[PDB]
Structure 1
Amino acid sequence: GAMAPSYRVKRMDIAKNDEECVVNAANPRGLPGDGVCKAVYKKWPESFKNSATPVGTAKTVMCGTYPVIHAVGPNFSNYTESEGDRELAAAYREVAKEVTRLGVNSVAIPLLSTGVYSGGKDRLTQSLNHLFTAMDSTDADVVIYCRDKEWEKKISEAIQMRT
């Protein structure tokens, strides 16, 4: 465990993280994809061997000794708001199980089901609250990665609010 488990947010490419493992915002088929998924494929392509997994699950594949946790959030283009919310919460619960099993002291994590899988809606708060629900009982240092300057400020405010 971390000595004083924390949440932090950074605005940069998650492929350049300083944590002991990474969460990929994966597709169900283990394809190189777009966005976070493509950056992860370029950095850790070996981790995409047998990485396909259903929506609402996470599957870890090692790149050398570095763990890549492929977490598959729902595409809100295809799911109802209700079913999509259930699967997005479940994906993060599976990430917490994997982080715990691996015994890492730190994890780099993107906000699942934002961007391409958002179905054109702002899901910062919905996705971040499901991240917190899952990760609050873990003792890893969590570092959230984002690309947008306004998102960085809003995520930083939500972290600081509960401290």
Structure 2
Amino acid sequence: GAMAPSYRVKRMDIAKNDEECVVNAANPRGLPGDGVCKAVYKKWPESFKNSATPVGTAKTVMCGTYPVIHAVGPNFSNYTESEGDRELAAAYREVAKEVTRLGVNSVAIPLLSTGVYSGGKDRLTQSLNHLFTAMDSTDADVVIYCRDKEWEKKISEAIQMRT
């Protein structure tokens, strides 16, 4: 584990992370997809061998010795708000189990279900709060990756509020 486990946020491509493993915002079928998923596919294509897994779960596949944790958040266009909230919290709990099992000291993570799976709604607070609930009991350094300047400021403020 990390000496003083922390949360940090960076506004950059998660495929260029400086952490010991990455969480992919995956689709259930292990397809290359779009957004974070396509960048992850271009950087670690070997990690997509048998990576298909149900919504609400996470499945790790090694690219060399680098772990790619494929986490499948719900698509809010298909799920109700209630059932979608439950699957989003579950996907993060499965990421925490995988990070612990791997024994890594750090992990790069995106905000699940905030892009094309958002159902057209701003889900920054909802997704980030489920991320904290799952990762707070782990001792890995967590680095959250985003692409928007206003989202970087809001995520940074949410982390600082707790310290």
Give TM class, smaller chain: over 0.9
TM-superposed CA distance for 1:57, in Å, is: 0.1
Taking only the aligned residue pairs, the percentage that are identical comes to: 100
How many residues matched?
Answer: 163
Structure 1 match to 2:123: 123
| Aligned mates of 1:115, 1:41 — CA distance in 2 | 17
Alpha-carbon displacement from aligned partner over 1:75-106 (angstroms, at most 9, x marks no partner)? 00000000000000000000000000000000
- Structure 1 residues not aligned, in runs of 5+: none
Cα-Cα RMSD: 0.1
Dislocated runs of 4+, deviation >6 Å: none
- Structure 2 residues not aligned, in runs of 5+: none
TM-superposed CA distance for 1:20, in Å, is: 0.0
Alpha-carbon displacement from aligned partner over 1:100-156 (angstroms, at most 9, x marks no partner)? 000000000000000100000000000000000000000000000000000000000
Task: Report the secondary structure of 2:116's partner residue.
Answer: helix
Task: Report the secondary structure of 1:115's partner residue.
Answer: coil
TM-superposed CA distance for 1:31, in Å, is: 0.1
Alpha-carbon displacement from aligned partner over 1:37-68 (angstroms, at most 9, x marks no partner)? 00000000000000000000000000000000
| Aligned mates of 2:75, 2:150 — CA distance in 1 | 23
| Aligned mates of 2:51, 2:27 — CA distance in 1 | 9
TM-score (norm 1): 1.00
| Aligned mates of 1:28, 1:108 — CA distance in 2 | 20
TM-superposed CA distance for 1:15, in Å, is: 0.1
Task: Report the secondary structure of 2:95's partner residue.
Answer: helix
